[PDB]
Design an enzyme around this catalytic site. Structure first.
Site, short mmCIF file in Angstrom:
data_model
loop_
_atom_site.label_atom_id
_atom_site.label_comp_id
_atom_site.label_asym_id
_atom_site.label_seq_id
_atom_site.Cartn_x
_atom_site.Cartn_y
_atom_site.Cartn_z
N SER A 46 0.80 -1.22 0.00
CA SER A 46 0.00 0.00 0.00
C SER A 46 0.84 1.27 0.00
O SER A 46 0.27 2.36 -0.20
CB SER A 46 -0.93 0.06 1.21
OG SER A 46 -1.94 -0.92 1.20
N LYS A 49 0.34 3.54 -2.92
CA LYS A 49 -0.71 4.56 -3.08
C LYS A 49 -0.14 5.97 -3.23
O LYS A 49 -0.79 6.82 -3.81
CB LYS A 49 -1.70 4.53 -1.93
CG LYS A 49 -2.59 3.26 -1.91
CD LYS A 49 -3.70 3.29 -0.83
CE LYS A 49 -4.65 2.06 -1.00
NZ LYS A 49 -3.79 0.78 -1.02
N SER A 94 -6.62 3.47 3.41
CA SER A 94 -5.87 2.51 2.60
C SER A 94 -6.81 1.61 1.80
O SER A 94 -6.65 0.39 1.74
CB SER A 94 -4.91 1.70 3.48
OG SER A 94 -3.83 1.22 2.68
#
Ligand code: NXL
Length: 245
Positions: A46, A49, A94
């Protein structure tokens, strides 16, 4: 680069392996625990991102940080995600499906162009909506550190408003003593769970950049909590959270 071997304390307390890198701009000090691991590549999970947000805003797929992608109606294991979310909300909880849809709208040829332009890790795409979570794309902790430092200083090849917007959504904790900005990640690689926290802490306007990368083969360890406890203990040890930096 100073080797800070005493930081092993905070990883050994949880019976995990890892590295920590801390670059204090104003004091011009650069400390690393586990230099060898800091140069090894791992899936970004993540933490990607940050990159997806930059490209999504820059290409205009994401209009601004309030841009909404509706819930697709697929019920996922995280309740936070089963909603219409703005970019800012999706970043902070997230929400993978938000950014999977961003990647599909960017499209693979455009995504490849931006990975190549930024020279992001091994620049490898498997599928357009899985490549940062499936161990095709990989990046080292040192590469993540350089990337977030460049983000902070507007040195990446994006518009200044693109980079300002991503820095804004990364702000997670704000007190008079400090502001903490980061993106977490957790992914799987062989038998291993890999945890990340990448970001910076600002005190009195002075940034200190960091990357934490952890791994365990213990399937019962709560990586989500352990990564945060380790970060807080390391930054406390290094003298942060009191407004003195
Ligand atoms: C990203 O690494 N992920 C999305 C989600 N939140 O992760 S975070 O806490 O690391 O920001 C759950 C873990 C992971 C995933 N399973 O894809």
């Amino acid at each position: 680069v100073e080797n800070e071997k005493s930081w092993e304390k905070y990883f050994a307390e949880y019976k995990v392996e890892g590295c920590f890198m801390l670059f204090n701009n104003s004091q011009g000090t650069f400390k690393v625990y586990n230099l060898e691991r800091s140069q090894q590549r791992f899936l970004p999970a993540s933490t990607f991102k940050i990159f997806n947000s930059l490209v999504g805003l820059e290409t205009g797929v994401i209009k601004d940080t309030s841009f909404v992608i509706p819930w697709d109606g697929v019920t996922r294991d995280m309740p936070e995600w089963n909603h219409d979310l703005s970019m800012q909300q999706a970043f902070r909880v997230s929400a993978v499906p938000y950014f999977q849809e961003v990647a599909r709208r960017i499209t693979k040829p455009v995504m490849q162009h931006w990975l190549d332009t930024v020279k992001f890790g091994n620049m490898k795409i498997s599928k357009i909506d899985t490549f940062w979570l499936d161990n095709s794309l990989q990046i080292s902790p040192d590469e993540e550190l350089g990337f977030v430092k460049k983000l902070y200083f507007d040195q990446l090849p994006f518009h200044k408003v693109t980079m300002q917007n991503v820095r804004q959504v990364m702000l997670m904790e704000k007190k008079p003593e400090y502001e903490l900005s980061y993106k977490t990640g957790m992914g799987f690689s062989g038998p291993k769970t890999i945890g990340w926290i990448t970001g910076w802490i600002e005190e009195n306007g002075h940034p200190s950049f960091f990357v934490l990368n952890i791994e365990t083969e213990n399937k019962s360890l709560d990586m989500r909590t352990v990564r945060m406890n380790i970060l807080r203990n390391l930054l406390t040890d290094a003298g942060y959270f009191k407004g003195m930096k």
